[PDB]
């Protein structure tokens, strides 16, 4: 029977060590959640960049259309002078 | 007091506490899984941001090319005007 006391006392000590072990593991996991939440904050900067790059694209195309309109007028002016010179060939 | 009853009751208490702590770890483990899902979504967001960056560069390149074509025309025009004024 004295061994029975030894079984329970030994198993209890094992359970209480297993508890400290599970708690220390939970403590580590809590930090992991903390670091990963910190990493997710980097998303705010990421979305801001995407909006900037997206915004700059549209602006570039708008600029491209205006310069096109200007290129067309110049091209037309040029053609008018060349046909005028062409008339005396 | 009854030691065998006292040890028995505490060990049963320890084993219930273990189950309880394990159920909490299972919750945190699922949180970590959700965060890993979100972290994958952040990488994809990073990819989308890079594509927009690339398309921005390509559009800017095109705008610069047409701008340069416009300039070479402005010059051709300038040459014609200096030539035409030479008659006048």
């Amino acid at each position: 029977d004295r061994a029975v006391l030894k079984e329970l006392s030994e198993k209890l000590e094992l359970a209480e060590k297993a508890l400290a072990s599970k708690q220390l593991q939970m403590d580590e996991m809590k930090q992991t959640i903390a670091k990963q939440e910190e990493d997710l904050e980097t998303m705010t900067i990421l979305r801001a960049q995407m909006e900037v790059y997206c915004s700059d694209f549209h602006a570039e195309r708008a600029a491209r259309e205006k310069i096109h309109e200007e290129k067309e007028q110049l091209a037309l002016q040029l053609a008018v002078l060349l046909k005028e010179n062409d008339a005396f060939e | 007091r009854a030691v065998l009853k006292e040890l028995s009751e505490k060990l049963e208490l320890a084993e219930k506490a273990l189950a309880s702590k394990q159920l909490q770890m299972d919750e945190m483990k699922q949180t970590i899984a959700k965060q890993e899902e979100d972290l994958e979504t952040m990488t994809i967001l990073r990819a989308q941001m890079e594509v927009y960056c690339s398309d921005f560069h390509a559009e800017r390149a095109a705008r610069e090319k047409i701008h340069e074509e416009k300039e070479q025309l402005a010059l051709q025009l300038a040459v014609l005007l200096k030539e035409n004024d030479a008659f006048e």
Partner: peptide
């Protein structure tokens, strides 16, 4: 007491264990 089967991975643990030897989960979890 006596040997017990892990309810998660089915490993048969010895009566002296409070966690499963393979998956480390407690007997009552």
């Amino acid at each position: 007491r006596g040997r017990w089967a892990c309810q998660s991975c089915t490993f048969e643990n010895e009566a002296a264990a409070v966690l499963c030897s393979i998956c480390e989960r407690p007997r009552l979890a």
